[PDB]
């Protein structure tokens, strides 16, 4: 018969136990059974977003028919899955596909109504096998569907339904729409208990029930891409894969060390100055110590919640994992790591440190971002530098951040260059700048520098972003910002902070510049802000430390060229003299260093005068800075 | 905010007893009143009631529609244009699930083109999208949040009853909006700023969900009554609503508490009591 | 058969020593192996802006399979590279693309789960044999993907992921996204040390290691 060639039997698969158990879905299986037993239009379609279990509802219907938990009208049905590609495949000649489809209809007539059919991806059917001599498979099943002689169960995605079936109103109305809503977190945990049994049996590991409730809860929180239970089942399954891989050869930490020692081994082999033999010896000793510990504990065998957390922290990038000791000792010394590039400015380093510490310790508000910030303070004191030190702390790279300069947004149009264009208009197909950048990388420091230069109501986009961490781009899809750090840097109290920083505490300074911002921003917007910091103007000792930072990076710039420089502290006191004024901050120091060092020094390098290898001493002249060769 | 909960409550109780007018949506509301007094929270508490989720609602943030050409983001792309086969954002998201709650968040930020679109929505329950077909809005509660009477309600809510305040802020709305769009409204409700008692109870709710976060983490907290009084007195000013409460709790509790959790200092299992020092709030272990 | 014609055996090419050595990419191949050994949805996809070495990750996995550094679950797997150009290549008659492709599905699922399938340019697979109202490669592979019987390592550019695969959200949920990071200056130096050996064997010259560290530094700094 044709049903042997072109259908694959589900109830034979359910009877031999080749289908995963189906848990919950009482309402939808009951409505599928109500709709399948009609007189005209026996046809349900299962409609819901991809991942919510529509094929699983048909497989639960097949298992309930095999177990006989259905009404008496269904005891003994066969549920046969129709594979439309297997119909289309060998139909080279004209009228071959229609012969196949008509043979299937004759055999389904001869079954005396005992066969439930099943066409997953029903949207495959509309326009299947059309040609010049088209009967299209939507125009041949249309009589057999209209008269109720065929018990087809489709299962199509909601967007695929709108695109492919509502383009054909006759075949749109042949089907009854059974909606399959996304299961919530609790229903997902029940589904994961049955599939816990099946995945434990496959991967030979043991999924602990806290890992299940972690997988459903965490993947409901930290993934907006996919839908339940599929994202939670994926966390469970990939976690069990990781545990079984650790069980197989050796854990991942010895894997890291083994790859690194073979890497640096053949890399030092390629170098045959180094600063490599030291690194290789340290990693070989670390490999020996952790292998000694692995022989001392002879390990992981179960999926706990820590494995779910590490799998989700490697899906996305959000640091959900438990803190290891290197990372935790790094993170308790947060402010020491930030004062290597931002000297002075303690209040902001305290604020930023505390926002990241609330993030990592898991006390952060899950409906808002990690922390919004408004770095006020005069020009040249460290606002943009703290954001670059944030990205260099957190992300190991200076320019690894979403930097949206708010000095291009001097008109109201240029909101559209961070939501994207609406439907119909030009840049529809590319989405926003900000929204695509977050939707790639959901854990990122979002900086909005020079924020007072923008149009006053460009910050309504930020009403949404700061309050709820969701911004809706042009095409429709909302992007989740709830794991980002939003930072806007301004200078709205420049002359006020330059004037009244003396004889005032931090609190009244914050209050007074906050009144200034109250005359600038809206009361909606300066309520969204987690913490407005106030920077302070830089003093002489601050500028001395900044001079030491800039001279260290100048030595870094001149070691690549092949030169050494030692300086005397008298010249550094001169740069502390010629690089001080309160009104312009720390850049007078930078251009004083630029002029009084790099112009005569590059003059003398390009003079054919300064031989490399000899230490360039920057002693003092009468007033200038000499560069000598000894 | 007793008046608004009465208004929304009566809208759903009019719908379930049959007495709704079936030529209109169920309730077309406009939430006025200053910042941080629970406009978006009444919308979230509705969707949590009616649908068992916080974001199970068609949340349209109206401050992304500040131009004249972003009406097409919700209606759809017109014939012969780029995103034609996907419709709009509002009409599809209703045409799937016709009994939903539509939050038109921060309504005054947009341009008045969207207000013409919502004239059709709020009066007759249909909004013909771009592909040329109606969409049934006779079953959705359309809710709009704004703060057009911010200075007026923050300054003059005292010594005035609710009706005179409603008339005064409705006059301010009449200056902002066309008479058409405020004629279609089922019920404009007016909020009021929060006193000490309201911020005290909101402080207890935010501390309950803080306890719930740390109970998920594995810790417990008992709090002193004096500690909760310092949280309620440090976070009280009438201008910013109930948000200085949230970030004051956030600072004074969650920064030193997470400081001590990350420090390897606070052992699990023990009740972390939050009692006060002279002015700070310290987390102790006994 | 069908796998002789419409696939290209990487492990034959790696075992003949015809591919480039692959250096680094440790977390990416480890998560590719963690995704390929699953029960359902065995399908990773390497995402990252073009140039970062995604085909190089899959060829590094093939060289680790041949030279024996993978776990025991992958010792002996073949890595076959599907050819989306050859499958449409002769099928102008109706059904013949689908005949070819379901022949590939038979001959792969008959291998008892031994052939790791690799499709560089997964976004070609999205709309491959989409005729005038017929079955493309997406709608055909789509039910053999979310049962784990097909081990399809995709590798698509991130921009074309958004253009072609997120347009069809079901094929989008079958593939587990493995991000591929743009490497640093230092990892680039290591990559250039192995490929220094190979390019010196090609051009009949020598390459001094200052030219490598200058090449990584200068190309990172000035070509944007
Ligand atoms: N109610 C459920 N009970 C048990 N397992 C379920 C349930 N819902 C989903 N699953 C599992 O979740 C995974 C995804 O569900 P699917 O039904 O395959 O998604 P879908 O319904 O096929 O949607 P598309 O568009 O076909 S991808 C499968 O492994 C199912 O076994
Ligand atoms: N605390 C600091 N430590 C080290 N360098 C600093 C510090 N503050 C400023 N600088 C230097 O200042 C330069 C730029 O300062 P920025 O903070 O970027 O100016 P700004 O704070 O952005 O103020 P405006 O209004 O944007 S000019 C950098 O090159 C730094 O070297
Ligand atoms: N009456 C209230 N009851 C409970 N929580 C409240 C209340 N008012 C404010 N909140 C809290 O404050 C936030 C809600 O403020 P919103 O209502 O969202 O502000 P808003 O009403 O939109 O005013 P604008 O227009 O944004 S300034 C949530 O975090 C709530 O926890
Ligand atoms: N880890 C690596 N080891 C060795 N060579 C590498 C490595 N990463 C990149 N390459 C080289 O980088 C070049 C590009 O690598 P590909 O894998 O082709 O990148 P690609 O991701 O395929 O780019 P597209 O987007 O697919 S065109 C080749 O010359 C590779 O040899």
Residue numbers in the entry:
A (entry chain C): 159 to 430, 441 to 466, 527 to 858
B (entry chain D): 573 to 858
C (entry chain B): 159 to 382
Q: What does the article say, verbatim?
A:
We studied the disaggregase ClpB, which contains tandem ATPase domains (AAA1, AAA2) and shifts between low and high ATPase and threading activities. ClpB is composed of tandem AAA domains (AAA1, AAA2), an N-terminal domain (NTD), and a coiled-coil regulatory M-domain, which forms a repressive belt surrounding the AAA1 ring (Carroni et al., 2014, Heuck et al., 2016, Oguchi et al., 2012). ClpB activation requires two signals: (1) interaction with the Hsp70 partner chaperone and (2) binding to substrate protein (Lee et al., 2013, Oguchi et al., 2012, Rosenzweig et al., 2013, Seyffer et al., 2012). Each AAA domain extends a flexible pore loop bearing a conserved aromatic residue, in most cases a tyrosine, which interacts with the backbone of the threading polypeptide.
We therefore made use of the derepressed ClpB-K476C M-domain mutant, which mimics the transient state of ClpB activation by Hsp70 (Oguchi et al., 2012). To allow stable substrate trapping, we used a ClpB-K476C-DWB variant and incubated it with an excess of casein in the presence of ATPγS. Substrate-bound ClpB-K476C protomers form a closed ring state and adopt an asymmetric arrangement with a right-handed spiral distortion closed by a seam between protomers A and F, as previously observed for ClpB-WT (Deville et al., 2017, Yu et al., 2018). The states were numbered according to the position of the AAA2 domain of the seam protomer F, the region undergoing the biggest conformational change and were termed KC-1, KC-2A/2B, and KC-3. In state KC-1, all six AAA2 pore loops contact the substrate with the AAA2F protomer positioned at the bottom of the spiral staircase. In the AAA1 ring, pore loops A–D are bound to the substrate, and protomers E and F are detached, with pore loop E at the top of the spiral arrangement of AAA1 loops and pore loop F in an intermediate position. In KC-1, the arginine finger of AAA1D is moderately displaced by 3 Å. This intermediate position suggests AAA1E is in an intermediate, not fully active state. In KC-1 and KC-2, the nucleotide binding pockets of AAA2B–AAA2E show clear densities for ATPγS and receive arginine fingers of their counterclockwise neighbors, defining AAA2B – AAA2E as active. In contrast, the arginine fingers of AAA2E and AAA2F shift 12-16 Å away from the nucleotide sites of AAA2F and AAA2A, respectively, defining AAA2F and AAA2A as inactive.
